[PDB]
Amino acid sequence: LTEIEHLVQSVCKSYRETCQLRLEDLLRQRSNIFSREEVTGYQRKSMWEMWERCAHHLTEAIQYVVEFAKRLSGFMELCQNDQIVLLKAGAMEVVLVRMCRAYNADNRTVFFEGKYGGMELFRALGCSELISSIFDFSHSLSALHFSEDEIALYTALVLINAHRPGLQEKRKVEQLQYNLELAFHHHLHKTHRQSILAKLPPKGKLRSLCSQHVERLQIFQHLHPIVVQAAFPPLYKELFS
Numbered sequence: 001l002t003e004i005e006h007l008v009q010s011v012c013k014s015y016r017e018t019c020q021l022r023l024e025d026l027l028r029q030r031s032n033i034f035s036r037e038e039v040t041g042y043q044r045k046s047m048w049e050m051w052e053r054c055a056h057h058l059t060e061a062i063q064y065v066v067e068f069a070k071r072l073s074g075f076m077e078l079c080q081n082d083q084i085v086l087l088k089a090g091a092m093e094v095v096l097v098r099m100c101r102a103y104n105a106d107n108r109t110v111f112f113e114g115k116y117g118g119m120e121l122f123r124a125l126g127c128s129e130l131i132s133s134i135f136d137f138s139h140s141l142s143a144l145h146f147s148e149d150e151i152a153l154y155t156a157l158v159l160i161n162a163h164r165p166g167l168q169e170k171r172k173v174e175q176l177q178y179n180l181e182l183a184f185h186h187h188l189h190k191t192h193r194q195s196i197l198a199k200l201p202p203k204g205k206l207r208s209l210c211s212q213h214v215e216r217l218q219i220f221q222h223l224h225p226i227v228v229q230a231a232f233p234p235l236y237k238e239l240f241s
């Protein structure tokens with residue numbers, strides 16, 4: 001009925017449509033785990049081949065988040081400067097949250113290229129601390145057993161944040177943010193899930209993990225650049241220098 005319950009519906013719709021894999025497909029594939037032969041197969045690959053595989057998977061993930069943002073009510077009505085500022089700071093933070101869906105807390109594995117595997121699968125990359133921190137973030141997020149609607153509403157709030165430095169129309173961003181906070185709060189009350197609010201990761205944790213991740217991606221892109229057909233060209237030039 002209210003403009004808020006419709007907001008919940010459209011945010012969940014944008015998310016349902018911009019998801020790469022279905023939650024039940026990832027849950028049913030938890031049995032399909034890489035063999036020790038397939039693991040060594042990945043470990044023996046060049047850093048540069050592993051980088052190309054991961055770089056493409058991560059650019060495609062960002063592109064789905066870009067589409068998710070495009071479909072959020074009022075995002076397109078914000079100015080290009082504000083759209084870049086939000087996506088630059090938040091798109092990879094959304095990808096990192098989304099990642100908990102493809103993470104199995106039982107054996108500490110992630111769904112990568114058709115099967116589940118441990119962090120050792122990424123050895124050739126030579127950035128074990130960063131990969132361990134990503135696996136740790138997904139492990140803490142998985143303990144919340146986030147529903148699909150909760151992850152949709154929370155990721156919208158990760159993106160729509162008026163506190164990002166460099167915004168031109170801060171007030172137009174605040175209005176979008178306040179409506180999404182009401183929508184998230186309203187939904188958690190309706191479903192008796194307000195208890196996750198105290199369990200959500202601190203703002204600084206996500207920002208800190210994301211800044212470390214993107215800077216490492218930026219080091220690899222400098223050393224071995226990949227080519228990507230840009231979905232949002234002005235965003236692409238701000239990240240790919």
Ligand SMILES: O=C(O)c1ccc(-c2nn(C(=O)c3c(Cl)cccc3C(F)(F)F)c3cccc(F)c23)c(F)c1
Nearest residue numbers: 058059062088091092217218221230231232235236239
């Ligand atoms: O318009 C597009 O299609 C588009 C696609 C990807 C990005 C993007 N890349 N990105 C990387 O960290 C990244 C990735 Cl995922 C792989 C290899 C190289 C990079 C690099 F570090 F170079 F940016 C991002 C980090 C945060 C926010 C982003 F928006 C991006 C982008 F800005 C635009």
